[PDB]
Amino acid sequence: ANPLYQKHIISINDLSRDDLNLVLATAAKLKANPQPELLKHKVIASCFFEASTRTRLSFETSMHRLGASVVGFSDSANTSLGKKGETLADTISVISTYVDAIVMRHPQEGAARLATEFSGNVPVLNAGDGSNQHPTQTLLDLFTIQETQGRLDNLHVAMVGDLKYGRTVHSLTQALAKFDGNRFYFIAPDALAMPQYILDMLDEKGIAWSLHSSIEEVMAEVDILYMTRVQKERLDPSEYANVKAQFVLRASDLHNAKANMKVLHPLPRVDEIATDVDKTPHAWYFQQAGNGIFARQALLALVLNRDLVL
Amino acid sequence: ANPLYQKHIISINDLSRDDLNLVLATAAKLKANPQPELLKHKVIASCFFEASTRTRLSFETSMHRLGASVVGFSDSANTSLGKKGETLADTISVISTYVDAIVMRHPQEGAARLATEFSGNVPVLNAGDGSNQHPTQTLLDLFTIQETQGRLDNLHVAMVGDLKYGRTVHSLTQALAKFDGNRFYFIAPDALAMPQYILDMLDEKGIAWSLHSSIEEVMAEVDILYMTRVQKERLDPSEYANVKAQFVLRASDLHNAKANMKVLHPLPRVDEIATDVDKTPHAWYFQQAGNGIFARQALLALVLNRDLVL
Amino acid sequence: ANPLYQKHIISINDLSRDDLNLVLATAAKLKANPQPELLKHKVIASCFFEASTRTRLSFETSMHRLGASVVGFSDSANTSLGKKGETLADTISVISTYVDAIVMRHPQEGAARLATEFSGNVPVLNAGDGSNQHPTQTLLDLFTIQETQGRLDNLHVAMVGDLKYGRTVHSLTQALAKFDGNRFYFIAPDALAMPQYILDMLDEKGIAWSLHSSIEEVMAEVDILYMTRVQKERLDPSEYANVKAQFVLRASDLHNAKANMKVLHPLPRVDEIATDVDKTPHAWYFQQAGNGIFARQALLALVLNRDLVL
Amino acid sequence: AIKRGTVIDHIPAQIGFKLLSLFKLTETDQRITIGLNLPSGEMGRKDLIKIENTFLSEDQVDQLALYAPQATVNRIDNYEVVGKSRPSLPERIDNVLVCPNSNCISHAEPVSSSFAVRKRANDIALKCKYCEKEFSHNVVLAN
Amino acid sequence: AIKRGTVIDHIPAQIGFKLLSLFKLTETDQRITIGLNLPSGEMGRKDLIKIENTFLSEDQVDQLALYAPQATVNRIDNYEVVGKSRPSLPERIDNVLVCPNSNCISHAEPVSSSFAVRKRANDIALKCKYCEKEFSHNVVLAN
Numbered sequence A, B, C: 001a002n003p004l005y006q007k008h009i010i011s012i013n014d015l016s017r018d019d020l021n022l023v024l025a026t027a028a029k030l031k032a033n034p035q036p037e038l039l040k041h042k043v044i045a046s047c048f049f050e051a052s053t054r055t056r057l058s059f060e061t062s063m064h065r066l067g068a069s070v071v072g073f074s075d076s077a078n079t080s081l082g083k084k085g086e087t088l089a090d091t092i093s094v095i096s097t098y099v100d101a102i103v104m105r106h107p108q109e110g111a112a113r114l115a116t117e118f119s120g121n122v123p124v125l126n127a128g129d130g131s132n133q134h135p136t137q138t139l140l141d142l143f144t145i146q147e148t149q150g151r152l153d154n155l156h157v158a159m160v161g162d163l164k165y166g167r168t169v170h171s172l173t174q175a176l177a178k179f180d181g182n183r184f185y186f187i188a189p190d191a192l193a194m195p196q197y198i199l200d201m202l203d204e205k206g207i208a209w210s211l212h213s214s215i216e217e218v219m220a221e222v223d224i225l226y227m228t229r230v231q232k233e234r235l236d237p238s239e240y241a242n243v244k245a246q247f248v249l250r251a252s253d254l255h256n257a258k259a260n261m262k263v264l265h266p267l268p269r270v271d272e273i274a275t276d277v278d279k280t281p282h283a284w285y286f287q288q289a290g291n292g293i294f295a296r297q298a299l300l301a302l303v304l305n306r307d308l309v310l
Numbered sequence D, E: 001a002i003k004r005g006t007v008i009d010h011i012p013a014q015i016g017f018k019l020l021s022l023f024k025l026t027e028t029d030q031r032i033t034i035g036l037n038l039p040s041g042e043m044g045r046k047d048l049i050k051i052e053n054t055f056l057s058e059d060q061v062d063q064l065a066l067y068a069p070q071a072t073v074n075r076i077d078n079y080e081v082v083g084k085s086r087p088s089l090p091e092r093i094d095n096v097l098v099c100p101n102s103n104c105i106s107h108a109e110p111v112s113s114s115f116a117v118r119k120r121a122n123d124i125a126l127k128c129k130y131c132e133k134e135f136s137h138n139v140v141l142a143n
């Protein structure tokens, strides 16, 4: 079978470069030649314990495009965990007797990992666990970078905003570090900096990164400008000075950009990207979102099918 | 047609032994040989007016495994009943113009019965009505007992915990009483005892039951040990002394159990079953939950199809 | 100095029978011969950290009838303890630099005792500390029993209602136990019974007491029927079965009552005393309330004026 | 055998460690020697704590009566036993215990706990100085 | 000075007592001898624990590594050191540690804690199986 058949997808740290490339090549083929009955007779759980628009809707759409059925919830408040005091462990223990895979987003770090200890032979797909990991975001992110840049090597990549709580950039930075010659620019408030465990990983791989207090410092050099939202629902009250976006991109900031440069953002944005950016050739956050469909279809097909032939 | 075609499934009291056996034999065949298009072109309403994890998700999964589509809600708060003051009667009157069957759980006793007076030719399936009935729980319960014990006659059955508000045990006790030579042990706080109408039924059928203040009194004699959660959302404030589980099963309490004995629990558990029970050969609450799929598939197939051939 | 000059008045357990008789004798005197300027140039704090009608208003009325000024609060919410997180200790440490005595009621047991450890030379008078003590209630109670029975020894005294959380009955039982030949009947729900430290005290002193299920059993014997309110604000939710008065006295239950028998209640009543009792010659709870003026004047006189009054 | 300090002898089994935990005897730089589950003669099995250059007042020695009534406290100087004493039940237990009444003022405020001690029917009753409720010593917890 | 059992030597000051709590070592009926603030040639001061007829569980010697790296564990039989060893720092510590990340799922739910341990620069970094966060073991020292 394929390397990802029946595998949990919890953290970028457990995936190899080859794994990531497999999802990307599979996503490219599905975008070109769709397989509407690939997951027929599959029933997949979509269990969101915190808010989502893109991750849940792209995930469920992907299941449907592949012919699978979907059960679950978008709020935990009417589950027995929400009203009768049930543990997440018991919750996973019973749902894993019903479905062929579990997609879960949860406000605590570790929830997806924990779920794997109760799901038996049922694969768990981490749609986000607190401020820790967001592997499927990275999959679509990588897919979008590959598409627009023609490569995943020797890129100049800026990541801007809340890097401490951004599960998006934790996963993305780990993934891009599995490739060669990438260079990182971290533009973040000191209180919301990139975590040291990420930097240590970059160091022990001999990957160049640097800190910057301004997008302008790096605009002329970057291939990917990856903007993030301040994760206010994760901030400690001692960090409430940072609630407002520190870095605001507008169309005028793009005058010295490389022509090929794309502005990414996992979304939603608050104020960190002005709406005048949307009409420029650099804006690519909606196209990026669109790509969630093909990455998530790809991942589902690989986890639930032994082999795929184009 | 089969005896259950187009029938409402409201209360165990309206079902015969033959009916229950029909669902069980049908559940066994579907578990062995699945029928993924049995309910094609059916649309079924899943209308939960109170919390659920197992009942709703197993029900909807079952619909999908049989090829039906599903509409409904897990919270009533965004229905017109929740925001515009609509009656349950009008709610059922209109949903019954859309769907082929209605699955409903509701916090008031009687709601499912009431629904039948407004649903016309559309069958109503009671997923729980207040502290009254839980017929589909009993179906999967009976199925699990049959599976593990080889029979539904001459069993020794302990029911523990909140028996007053346990719709689970109201239905289960009525069902098991339709079979021969069963013996019951009721272990409950005096304030949450088994209701007299249940006991009266047991008496007029010459069925032996007795009250016990301890699981240890009966451990060596029981084939099925059926644990329950205290139904705190149903307690009168005068009954708040009973909010905590009175009887706590742990692995050490099982030393004198019969080898064949199984521990059941309709779930969720709070503290009445310690997690050290889970690894013992007696723990069977998750396997029981798993069986919800086959009982509920069976019931749906029988209500919406004139005849089934294996 | 009189025995009570500059004394803290925290617990009946700290007072002797001679102390009690001293208050009472002083109460008689000032009732007959008011001394409207006895406490002129005194400023007294009235600090109520939980609700009161009788105790706070009678105390403040008493201070004015004796010519003293009053400062304080009837609610802690706008003190610096309420809004700025100040401890009770610091609150007492500052207030005791302002006034000549501190009258305090508080929802935690032992608050008054604590205050004495920070009030330096300023006496603390306990207006009630949680479900612990209410020594000024006892003083007016004793004055009332004396007024209507002619004595404090060899009486039959029934106490009814919430005896566990009744700070009134804790203090009063301790006080009456300091006299000779008194007989106690305790009519309470099992869950709200008189605490073992009270019963032990009685046994040690060779005092007769008995548990009873009804008012009618003891009605023909009792000289004082002391009714209490269920202390719902003190109840653990595990005791919420007892919120409703278990014993309701009406005019009709007073048929075989002795002509000397008075019905007392420290008030407020809920339904434990029907309004039809109000008009009977046995009703004395309002007279009792009025006697708080004379007990509280007396106590203030003895604590703040060194000479015995005349 | 120590030169100078205190030897708490005849501590009942399983008590020695509790006394160390409770009275924080190990919070010092002084040499401490502990024997647990040692054989006795009058007791069979016993625990034993020696602390160098450290002495126990009579009150301190009395605080042990709650846990080791039959204990022996040898004060020691120049390798010699210069004084021997026994716990007699104290009038009060301060600081170390926690009042079990959740609504007592002692939990919220900067005071030390304090209980009056009394013998009650082959049990010891503890009466909190503040809230005045009384408890079996068994249900009054430490810290 | 025992015949068969274990001697944990070279325990740093103020750690000996913390080891007796955690490893529940005094919950045996076996003779135990403890020296606290003993003089040491190598360490100046040290603590020492002797347990007759008893040997550590491999997790306890695994757990021993971060509490007392320089500690020394001697196995004894027939009054002889038949085994002497220094605590080997494993890569995984389960059950006894608490993740300092308050938003970690391991707090709310019935799973055993689990950390990946590796030497880092000066101190030890401990990485949680669940939240994937890494911490200095000084931060996991208190809990």
Ligand SMILES: O=c1ccn([C@@H]2O[C@H](COP(=O)(O)OP(=O)(O)OP(=O)(O)O)[C@@H](O)[C@H]2O)c(=O)[nH]1
Pocket (backbone or CB within 6 Å): D001, D033, D035, D038, D039, D040, D041, D042, D043, D044, D048
């Ligand atoms: O430093 C140490 C080590 C050990 N011990 C040990 O203490 C134990 C006491 O032995 P003892 O000789 O001191 O007293 P005893 O047992 O004969 O009589 P009682 O105390 O029961 O009244 C013996 O087992 C001894 O080895 C010490 O007294 N000090």
Ligand SMILES: O=c1ccn([C@@H]2O[C@H](COP(=O)(O)OP(=O)(O)OP(=O)(O)O)[C@@H](O)[C@H]2O)c(=O)[nH]1
Pocket (backbone or CB within 6 Å): E001, E010, E035, E038, E039, E040, E041, E042, E043, E046, E048
């Ligand atoms: O079994 C023992 C071992 C040692 N000790 C006590 O330990 C003290 C140290 O004497 P040691 O010989 O045992 O250790 P050390 O001085 O060589 O110093 P290290 O480098 O080994 O750490 C001694 O003074 C003695 O009192 C015991 O009491 N019992």
Ligand SMILES: O=C(O)C[C@H](NC(=O)CP(=O)(O)O)C(=O)O
Pocket (backbone or CB within 6 Å): A051, A052, A053, A054, A055, A056, A128, A134, A137, A167, A168, A228, A229, A266, A267, A268
């Ligand atoms: O929330 C963010 O800012 C980034 C990221 N966003 C998403 O996944 C998109 P959504 O929350 O709509 O599914 C996330 O971690 O949830």
Ligand SMILES: O=C(O)C[C@H](NC(=O)CP(=O)(O)O)C(=O)O
Pocket (backbone or CB within 6 Å): A080, A084, B051, B052, B053, B054, B055, B056, B128, B134, B137, B167, B168, B228, B229, B266, B267, B268
């Ligand atoms: O809630 C219980 O304790 C028993 C019983 N439980 C269930 O049906 C399982 P769920 O509420 O997750 O659907 C019920 O009556 O709802």
Ligand SMILES: O=C(O)C[C@H](NC(=O)CP(=O)(O)O)C(=O)O
Pocket (backbone or CB within 6 Å): C051, C052, C053, C054, C055, C056, C128, C134, C137, C166, C167, C168, C228, C229, C266, C267, C268
């Ligand atoms: O509240 C009671 O029932 C009895 C008693 N009542 C009073 O003191 C009268 P008041 O609360 O109006 O001052 C008390 O303990 O506070």
Ligand SMILES: [Zn+2]
Pocket (backbone or CB within 6 Å): C110, D099, D100, D101, D104, D105, D106, D128, D129, D130, D131, D132, D133
């Ligand atoms: Zn107290």
Ligand SMILES: [Zn+2]
Pocket (backbone or CB within 6 Å): A110, E099, E100, E101, E104, E105, E106, E128, E129, E130, E131, E132, E133
């Ligand atoms: Zn963690």
